[PDB]
Write an enzyme that holds these catalytic residues in place. Sequence first.
Site, mmCIF file in Angstrom:
data_model
loop_
_atom_site.group_PDB
_atom_site.id
_atom_site.type_symbol
_atom_site.label_atom_id
_atom_site.label_comp_id
_atom_site.label_asym_id
_atom_site.label_seq_id
_atom_site.Cartn_x
_atom_site.Cartn_y
_atom_site.Cartn_z
ATOM 1 N N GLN C 11 11.360 -34.789 -61.070
ATOM 2 C CA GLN C 11 9.925 -35.030 -61.105
ATOM 3 C C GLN C 11 9.216 -34.043 -62.020
ATOM 4 O O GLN C 11 8.322 -34.436 -62.766
ATOM 5 N N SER C 129 13.844 -28.405 -64.645
ATOM 6 C CA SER C 129 13.303 -27.154 -64.122
ATOM 7 C C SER C 129 14.444 -26.368 -63.499
ATOM 8 O O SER C 129 15.621 -26.686 -63.697
ATOM 9 N N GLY C 132 15.248 -27.693 -58.530
ATOM 10 C CA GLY C 132 15.408 -29.010 -57.953
ATOM 11 C C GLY C 132 16.847 -29.341 -57.598
ATOM 12 O O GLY C 132 17.775 -28.989 -58.316
ATOM 13 N N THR C 168 6.719 -23.050 -54.658
ATOM 14 C CA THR C 168 6.434 -24.058 -53.644
ATOM 15 C C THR C 168 7.737 -24.472 -52.955
ATOM 16 O O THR C 168 7.731 -24.888 -51.797
ATOM 17 N N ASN C 195 4.538 -21.358 -64.934
ATOM 18 C CA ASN C 195 3.230 -21.973 -64.930
ATOM 19 C C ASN C 195 2.150 -21.011 -64.476
ATOM 20 O O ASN C 195 0.980 -21.258 -64.772
ATOM 21 N N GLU C 243 19.969 -24.591 -87.303
ATOM 22 C CA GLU C 243 19.546 -23.233 -87.612
ATOM 23 C C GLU C 243 19.072 -22.458 -86.394
ATOM 24 O O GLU C 243 18.967 -21.233 -86.464
#
EC number: 3.6.5.-
Lengths: 369, 426, 429, 141, 43
Positions: C11, C129, C132, C168, C195, C243
Amino acid sequence: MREIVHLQAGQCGNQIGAKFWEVISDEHGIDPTGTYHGDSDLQLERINVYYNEATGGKYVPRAVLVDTMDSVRSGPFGQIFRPDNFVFSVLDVVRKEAESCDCLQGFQLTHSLGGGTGSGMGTLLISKIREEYPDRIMNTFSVVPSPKNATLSVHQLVENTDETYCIDNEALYDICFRTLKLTTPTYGDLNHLVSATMSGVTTCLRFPGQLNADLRKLAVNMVPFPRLHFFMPGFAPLTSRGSQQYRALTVPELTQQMFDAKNMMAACDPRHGRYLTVAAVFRGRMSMKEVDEQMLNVQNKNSSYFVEWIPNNVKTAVCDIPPRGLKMSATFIGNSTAIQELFKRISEQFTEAESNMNDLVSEYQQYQD
Amino acid sequence: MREIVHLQAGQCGNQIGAKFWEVISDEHGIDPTGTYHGDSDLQLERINVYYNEATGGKYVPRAVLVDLEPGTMDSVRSGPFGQIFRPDNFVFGQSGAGNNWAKGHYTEGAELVDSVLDVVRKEAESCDCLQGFQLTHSLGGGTGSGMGTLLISKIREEYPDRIMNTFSVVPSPKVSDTVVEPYNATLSVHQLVENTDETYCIDNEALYDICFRTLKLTTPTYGDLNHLVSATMSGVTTCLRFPGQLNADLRKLAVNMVPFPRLHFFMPGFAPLTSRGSQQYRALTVPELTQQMFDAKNMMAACDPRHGRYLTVAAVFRGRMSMKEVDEQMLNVQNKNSSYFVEWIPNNVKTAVCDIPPRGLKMSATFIGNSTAIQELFKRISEQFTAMFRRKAFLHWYTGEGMDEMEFTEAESNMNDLVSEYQQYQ
Amino acid sequence: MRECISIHVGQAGVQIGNACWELYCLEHGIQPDGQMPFNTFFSETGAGKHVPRAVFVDLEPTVIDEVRTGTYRQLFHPEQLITGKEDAANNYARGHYTIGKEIIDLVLDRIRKLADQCTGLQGFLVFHSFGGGTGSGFTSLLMERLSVDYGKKSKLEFSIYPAPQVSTAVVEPYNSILTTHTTLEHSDCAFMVDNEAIYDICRRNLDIERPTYTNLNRLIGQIVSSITASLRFDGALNVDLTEFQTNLVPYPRIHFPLATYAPVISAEKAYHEQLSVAEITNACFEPANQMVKCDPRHGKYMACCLLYRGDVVPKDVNAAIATIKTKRTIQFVDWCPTGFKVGINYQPPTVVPGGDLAKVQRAVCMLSNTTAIAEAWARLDHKFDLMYAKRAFVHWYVGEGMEEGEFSEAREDMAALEKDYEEVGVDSV
Amino acid sequence: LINPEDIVPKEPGSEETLRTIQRPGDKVSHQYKTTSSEINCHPIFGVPTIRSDISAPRIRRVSDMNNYGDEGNAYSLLHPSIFSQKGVFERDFFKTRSKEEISDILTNIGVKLSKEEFENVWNLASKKHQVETIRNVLDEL
Amino acid sequence: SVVPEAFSTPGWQIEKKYSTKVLLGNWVEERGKFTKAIDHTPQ
């Protein structure tokens, strides 16, 4: 893709599951004769979770009523049901619906832990379903007697279900007198409030939210060790006829009333409690720095009282679809040390079952230490 | 100038062919009340292959529509194209065919000479030229393996020179309709060897399979099931009927594909098949049609072509096409897959080209294949014969109408001797 | 024709993929339905349509289903939108062992079908991420099954790094330390974002209070469009995709660099003050503008790769690079006296319509491999130690096939990764 | 007596069916629009790198470091036109001269022009513009 | 050798059947009506 079989067992479970079906039907737009109303396209996308349909716009639930039943059908939404499975056989009907189902995940059994029908027949029928489908989750909503029968009942149930919800009518009454200013507690109001607390956690199964967590994920998140599974519910944005125009609505405001001690479903003591796992399920259109900042700010205000030796003592969930009427709402659920007092009173009130209850009390003690 | 005679018989052949005279209708632009409407004058110069003439520009098909019932000619006239078919060539039978090949073949053996033979010689002699004879019978019924398959040995007795081309419907055990299918289909494939050189094989499980894996429609009727064969039957004569680049005909498809007089049981296919949702996302070009062409899932006789080596393989093409890559991927698939072709034969692929694509398409490539795994079709229908013969269970319908036990043993005694040739040259 | 495959898995990678294919479509003349009234990311069919190269695989039903009913439903191949049945529940043995094993035969053909269509393919753009069951465990399924097949090819993954102070998830560090167990073997550029810094970048420069998640998908959207501009737009100083494995990683397990994008600004501040070339690269190095939560003042920069964009002149670049490298504040490493790397292109910074940004003529994207992220690995195994001591939360990961025999085997491998910022950080003589 | 609209039924792209009635206080379309589902020309700010928008000063200060442009390319400094070799330049081309100035230019640059041809040349130059204009119009026409 | 399949191609096993509004197995290919368009016979 998650699925649900709902069984009303025992009298109190029957009348609370009736309000359950009324609440989910009004949130999904079905006329009680069974016809669909399609104002929005999000209503019918995951009706497969709780229903199977009929020819001509009629729908009918995946629910069995086993134990009153004439009173339920005489009530508000009786006409939706299947008149062929009103059993009073249970093995045949549970494999019938569970064999017509595609991929099964979980079961909603409404009972109690204080009487001759909700407890013994509840334990018998949970045994009779766990012997048939050993890979599902039994959400068995329950009512226990006030600390001011269950020892016979619970000692197969704690092995089997792990998803029971046991604090009760004294807390419900005091919520009604204080935070609602509600003068006459009728039984139907408590059935309504428990039913909305049922429906609050069934939106990650039916709607596309934002942080989508289904029931198996909830099991893995909440339950650390395989015998600490009795949970504490509560519904936040409740107020009276007067105080609405005096209060405001924000995520920091609903955080206050989802961690309000007078709001939770408990005649218990969070001042003597320590939450192992918290989940706050939100419904509405809300920004999420407010959610995460308020989450860890209200965890920051209490370092002692949320549990030590766990870094993240809380968890949030959020869906994009609020309840009816209210722009946003919250439902708090906890797993604390504030619950063994009921066990102590119900044990101070066969003998190996009593010893197993003393084992569970010592289990809380040795893990709180 | 090379006119084609189609013999439609049975409850099958009047509802399979009832879709076959519809794609001949639009690819020549024929209205369902007789006259031609269109603009391009390429497709009325060779209109006479399938359409005779009358006054007022009206075109009726050269057609034979026969049954022993009156049942299905109240349905082919009840379709959209029923006025097109000729009024006299519906040849009736007031009684019923009734599931048995005994009633049609010997009891109604003397009836068919007045019925079908006197309409054919009235017609097929009246054409200014002729090419061949093409009949579609169900093996597992009463009229198709009754009236029809005796006629396959009747006109062939008159004219030996021409070409027989039977799109034959052999049944399958999984999707079944009648329990005595070893008693009407086994008793006709002994006759097909002597009298039918080009013998196709159509199944009823592989046809649903194509409308499951490929076209993705979930509740397929017979009408959707009968255009995957009605495109095939119209798509094999695409050079006897239209101009192009490298034309072929029904002798030029039989020289390449029949090496031996009894090694002549083909199996079909049809290339450009893609679903109902992804129309535009696939680029219909040459290397994608030939990737659809060769695999196991696309081929219409329900057999796995990997267990048996192809002795010979044919094709055809349509549409404005560049020859080079067409002739190039069929250089690769013989070369990379040397395991799934025999040795001892240098070339195994035939290609032929047309100019016009079909209605609503750009390219097409009908497939015809002689493989030595058609014995998989003919071992299962003899596996169940003598496992039923030993209890003699349904014999008491067949000694009462005029055939012996002794012709029952010979029809399987040569059925293995068919399979004894495919197995040796494997 | 230097194409890449752009999967969006989990997600936390697909709403960015909503915003990723917005920004590619608006950049060109391509409509949402794919009809142009591009060849890096888009396959074109001759009817008039364009089809992107993106497969949207996740176990969660609704986030793919909100696209097939969404306004971008006429864009993708509708067999690329792959969904299983039940979610992975943030459990490594559910997103890699019990439900993720059912869908790997399908997606081996789907990367093969796209790559047989492509001509000059140069790698992959996976978007995942680090927390998960279906976002961090399952991307290590789609990684080891490709290097056994595709092998030597340039893989660029944009992975939301688990933040220092916020999170979270709860049972997160059990398989994040298992994600790195194989992506050290088979990842060559695994970019990372916290974040938490973008939560505060909006609060200082952007005049933003209450930011949603839809704003952070756009700023992550630009960084992907900054690194992929040198494939679709020819420039003065190109930087191509092979590169990046000789510029950046000096020793084969130091391949985890940062990212930022300097002139994030609203429409009332950018009107007031100008933007030269010698100050948007000064705004790169200031500690109030990096998009990942870190303080660079304790870190010595190893190899920046400044990606410029828009209206820049190459003497203005080298005037600015010598002003900055003489500064007494920001420190470097002695065995890299080369240091920097520029990229200059003639295509401007794009703007999404209805957004909060301003029409700036110049915008840069510095992609700094740094030192300072080692002390953010001090906390990611300190978090792992405490749960694993009392065997907490293990009772579910052992539910679906995994055992205790791997959890300590991964911890030493993340212990050995923290050492390799000390053999190379302690300078030779 | 019936409505002129009768809808299709199957969600897939069906046989006809009537329009289902949405009852009052049960219309949730205006309220239940997910932001994710919702997710499913201007002036230009800054300075130009050439600074052509600002007028150029007549006499430059020594401290002038701004970019004006009047300094052409190095190719136009290494192979100049004779105008640039004679010291005349493009602002003297593009300046607004007078009718008498162009009239003095005509008979003294070696071109004999009719009066009507001069009026037509001025008209064509003014139509070409939103010396270079006069020379271009005289060359084209 | 077998060749790969997606979800819900054959339906040789017996499934319950929904109206295609509900997002169920094999919804999309029956949602989209099959489309064709021609102009004339080419040369």
